[PDB]
């Protein structure tokens with residue numbers, strides 16, 4: 001189905017034999033060492049805990065997005081009565097519950113799993129400080145800055161290879177290495193988490209799945225780095241050579257942490273800046289781990305980028321942007337066709353107005369430097385009642401975000417995310433008006449899909465108020481504010 005709010009306001013955009021074989025002994029041994037070292041590193045200072053029912057309730061009520069009934073499933077003491085029961089089973093080492101019932105069972109499982117392994121996300125075990133290479137909890141407003149730090153590290157090009165169907169390439173060996181978490185746990189906690197882990201052995205909820213994919217991808221890049229640096233090679237794949245074991249152990253212990261900070265890793269998405277370009281041909285362990293690269297012959301050298309500003313990560317590239325007061329932002333950027341395309345899809349008049357509004361406010365926060373999106377966002381916001389709370393999923397590409405899910409003034413939240421809470425903004429002086437929030441540079445805007453300079457869009461910009469009026473009329477008699485004369 002089509003969002004008719006974005007539709008009526010974006011007129012120019014109209015006419016647009018199974019696999020993962022288990023690894024060989026050599027590779028399994030190196031991964032084992034690497035995953036042993038990484039777990040010990042991620043457990044450095046934090047210590048595991050169970051997550052509470054209250055925490056789960058708080059987590060259900062915010063973002064991201066089903067949940068219509070989740071909120072409703074929680075306060076029902078019959079739901080915590082099945083949960084109580086199934087938890088009592090998990091503690092024996094038995095599981096079975098993983099309409100009313102066959103929805104409660106599904107949601108219960110998510111709680112049990114959040115109770116037992118939730119600490120990985122909630123305490124940011126994969127956050128950059130704790131994981132060195134991870135980026136958990138960072139919005140798009142932060143990631144570019146991380147790419148600029150990674151690119152700051154001297155060496156080869158920056159690589160960013162995708163895997164050919166990641167979840168498909170997880171081996172039993174990856175699973176056992178992930179399951180070492182258990183060794184960090186004791187008591188009930190350990191029994192409960194053991195029950196959750198032993199479920200995929202018979203399919204996690206993205207809560208845990210992201211943490212575990214990131215953990216595993218971090219390790220995979222560590223191994224590919226070792227091989228690029230000549231610590232291991234082709235002759236170590238089947239069986240590790242004469243005393244390479246300790247060479248590998250001491251390589252982890254003395255380089256692991258530095259090398260982690262040459263990475264930005266989100267689930268199956270990774271960016272790595274190795275010591276040199278030998279990395280481009282380090283494919284022996286990679287391929288034998290079944291982590292085959294997408295869209296490239298098994299043994300062709302990888303290619304990388306020189307400029308951090310064009311490396312893709314979480315479907316965006318990132319750019320430096322100079323504001324009128326001389327300050328520099330680093331901002332996300334992706335094809336504008338994909339951005340408007342996504343907002344024109346509706347996955348009810350109020351509900352779709354509220355979703356258009358979240359797309360608009362999402363754009364105002366993340367993609368304000370795009371001329372068309374800034375204009376379209378204000379049209380949307382002008383056409384949807386001021387008091388309608390933005391609703392619905394706008395972030396496909398599940399990272400974090402959601403600061404746009406509000407009724408608060410968008411200049412105020414822009415200031416909070418881009419200045420006040422931006423740790424890469426030294427000078428904390430606020431921006432007083434939208435006109436001081438910068439655009440990207442005509443030529444760059446045009447490069448990423450802008451229609452500026454086009455006729456269809458000229459007559460759209462000039463007539464925009466007619467379209468806004470048309471949407472106001474369909475939605476009906478409500479309070480509207482004009483945001484067009486802040487452009």
Ligand SMILES: [Zn+2]
Nearest residue numbers: 095096097098
């Ligand atoms: Zn169960």
Ligand SMILES: [Zn+2]
Nearest residue numbers: 317333334448
């Ligand atoms: Zn761009």
